[PDB]
């Protein structure tokens, strides 16, 4: 992995820095690294592919060292370097794809492809260059068992789930009370509704709670908290709990009362925010607990007193809500997020080459299922394939 | 066992209720479903 990353980095630097007319002092170190790579890789034979529709490819290395006896690079030097660079880039591409399309139940962190296992030998350690990239840095840190960390913009940590709970209900679905939530990607929208508008509740207050446990611990997360659930504030016809009928939900939105957002780690409240909306910070947590209330307005104008009667024919159903977006976070484990493209790259390679469903990842790399059951083996394999995808992306775009 | 005196048409007696059992209804439902599927180009994608 480190050697493959070094190959990719050396090739990217060769393509970026070896240009016509450049001073040789601008490249001398890179040229030493490139000649070291050629010397190490010469005389070895590699084979990639053979899984799914990924073509079998054989790679042989016999290249001359790039020169070191010019002041400014000319067309000759660039042309001589470019052929070697192209062959090496194709080799790195195929190695990365072959490693990405593979997985293992046991020792998923270990290299799986023949090419990468060969590169893991000791003869290839002479090419390491510099492990600057974030993913390779976290790879090395995890190998040393130091603390890793990936920064995500809008991390995908909540498996898609749209559901509702009915604490009070009847066959006619005329006098419901409960909660109704969507958790998707980096957003939680939760609405607590009551058809009676807390007419008979103690103190004219109905309490609502919603607990979202994360699969991994998130750190130094910036959150956006807003006092309405726009998704759950329009008339809906909703299938019943058992799917045998449909009920009607006609919300009227009130301000949520005594809003309390707790970010908890190991059952201990780490961060607590009361009646504070907008940008908030959760330093370290693994569960989000949203508590709010529907308080029947003590004073009402006629147009509201009409809406909220005492008897059963409730035409408007009181609803409170909360929206919570994780703008940016840090996780020790790898995750999909809005900004990056590693999950898309891996899924794209698998779909393009029709890789059979293996024993670790769900079919089609379904992120919902993966995050829902994010086992240690899946974390290992996913970090491996994401790191390989980053290495590949350094060269392929 | 014995085919006691003047045993009737046992096969027909069995089939009379067999063709009305729930299994027969399920077979008829499956056949009708397949026929409708073969008939309903127009519906196109109107089956879950």
């Amino acid at each position: 992995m480190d050697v493959l990353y070094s190959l990719s980095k050396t090739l990217k630097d060769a393509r970026d820095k070896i240009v016509e007319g450049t001073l040789y002092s601008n490249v001398s170190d890179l040229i030493q690294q490139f000649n070291q790579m050629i010397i190490t890789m010469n005389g070895n034979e590699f084979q990639t592919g053979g899984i799914g529709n990924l073509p079998i490819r054989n790679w042989n290395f016999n290249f001359g060292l790039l020169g070191t006896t010019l002041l400014n690079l000319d067309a000759n030097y660039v042309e001589t370097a470019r052929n070697t660079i192209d062959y090496f880039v194709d080799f790195v591409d195929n190695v990365c794809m072959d490693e990405m399309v593979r997985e293992s139940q046991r020792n998923g962190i270990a290299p799986q492809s023949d090419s990468l296992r060969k590169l893991s030998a000791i003869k290839f350690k002479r090419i390491n260059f510099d492990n600057s990239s974030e993913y390779i840095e976290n790879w090395n840190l995890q190998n040393r068992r130091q603390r890793t960390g990936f920064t995500f913009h809008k991390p995908n940590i909540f498996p898609y789930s749209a559901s509702f709970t009915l604490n009070r209900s009847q066959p006619a679905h005329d006098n419901l009370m409960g909660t109704m939530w969507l958790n998707a990607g980096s957003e939680i929208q939760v609405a607590g509704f009551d058809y009676s508008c807390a007419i008979n509740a103690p103190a004219n207050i109905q309490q609502f709670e919603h607990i979202v446990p994360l699969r991994r611990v998130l750190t130094t997360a910036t959150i956006t908290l807003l006092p309405d659930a726009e998704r759950f504030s329009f008339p809906r016809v909703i299938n019943s709990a058992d799917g045998a009928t449909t009920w009607f939900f006609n919300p009227v939105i009130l301000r949520p009362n005594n809003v309390e957002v707790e970010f908890l780690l190991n059952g201990q409240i780490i961060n607590t925010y009361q009646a504070r909306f907008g940008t908030i910070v959760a330093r370290n947590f693994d569960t989000i607990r949203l508590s709010f209330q529907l308080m029947r307005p003590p004073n009402m104008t006629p147009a509201v007193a009409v809406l909220f009667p005492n008897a059963q024919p409730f035409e408007h159903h009181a609803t409170v809500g909360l929206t919570l977006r994780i703008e940016s976070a840090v996780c020790e484990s790898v995750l999909a997020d809005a900004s990056e493209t590693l999950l898309a790259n891996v899924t794209s390679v698998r779909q393009e080459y029709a890789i059979p469903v293996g024993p670790v990842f769900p079919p089609g790399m379904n992120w919902t299922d993966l995050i829902t059951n994010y086992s240690p083996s899946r974390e290992d394999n996913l970090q491996r394939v994401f790191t390989v995808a980053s290495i590949r992306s350094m060269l392929i775009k | 066992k014995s085919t006691i005196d003047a045993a009737k048409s046992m096969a027909t007696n069995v089939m009379k209720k067999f063709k009305k059992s729930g299994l027969a209804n399920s077979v008829s439902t499956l056949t009708d479903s397949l026929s409708d599927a073969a008939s309903s180009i127009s519906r196109g994608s109107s089956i879950r």
Binding site: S163, A172, M180, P309 | -
Partner: protein
């Protein structure tokens, strides 16, 4: 089968009945055919109701029907004939048969009674219900009346077959009902009764099934049709039985899972 407890029900967003038809005797008189029940049964059969699942109940008047109107059926549809002078009687009958009431006894000769909240009422049914009330202050003395003398009491009903009485809450009253020909019960309105629907014939949607003066809600189970022939009335009911049933629903108290929640 964990009866008696209320447990939250979680659902996912991304995914043999009997019908009773109550009608006034006037309808049968106009029909003037003795095979009309069988005719309607066969028409209901065409609509899908197997023979024998539709029962036809006859009552002589709203007054007579209001005396303990027991409705035993999975679905009930009552044809109520509108009379401009019986608006309160129709409203009380509809309120009694479109809602679930939990009623406790009342011993007027032994206790003073008060109504605890808006959901509490006094339901009196019998041959002739005459209810007189004397409100008492905190000292147990009449306000505008004298407990000893029942003539001074305030009369809130007279020879009523069915009466729903709503006195001011939080104040004790001494009652002087005619227990000989009436039974009065302290009832509380639990909620709607989805088992029953009322179809008024004639009139202009005059039904207040809520004691609150600020609301006269018109539930889906309260319907009204203009009429001139009872045959046309019955044909309409038969033809649109599907819509009527869809408007109604099975009785929640009847359904299992109502055990230990005032079943049936």
């Amino acid at each position: 089968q964990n009866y008696g407890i209320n447990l939250p029900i979680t659902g996912s967003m991304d995914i043999t009945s009997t019908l009773c038809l109550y009608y006034p005797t006037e309808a049968a008189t106009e029909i003037n055919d003795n095979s009309w029940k069988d005719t309607l049964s066969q028409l209901f059969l065409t609509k899908g109701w197997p023979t024998g699942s539709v029962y036809f109940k006859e009552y002589t008047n709203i007054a007579s029907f209001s005396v303990d109107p027991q409705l035993y059926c999975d679905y009930n549809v009552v044809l109520m004939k509108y009379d401009a002078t019986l608006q309160l009687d129709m409203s009380e009958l509809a309120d009694l048969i479109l809602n679930e009431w939990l009623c406790n006894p009342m011993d007027i000769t032994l206790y003073y009674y008060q109504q605890t909240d808006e959901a509490n009422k006094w339901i009196s049914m019998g041959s002739s219900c005459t209810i007189k009330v004397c409100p008492l202050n905190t000292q147990t003395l009449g306000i505008g009346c004298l407990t000893t003398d029942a003539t001074t009491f305030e009369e809130v009903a007279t020879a009523e077959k069915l009466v729903i009485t709503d006195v001011v809450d939080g104040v004790n009253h001494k009652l002087d009902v005619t227990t000989a020909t009436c039974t009065i019960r302290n009832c509380k309105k639990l909620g709607p009764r989805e088992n029953v629907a009322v179809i008024q014939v004639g009139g202009s949607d005059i039904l207040d099934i809520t004691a609150d003066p600020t609301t006269a809600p018109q539930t889906e189970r309260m319907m009204r049709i203009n009429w001139k022939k009872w045959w046309q009335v019955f044909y309409t009911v038969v033809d649109y039985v599907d819509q009527i049933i869809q408007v109604m629903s099975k009785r929640s108290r009847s359904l299992n899972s109502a055990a230990f929640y005032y079943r049936v």
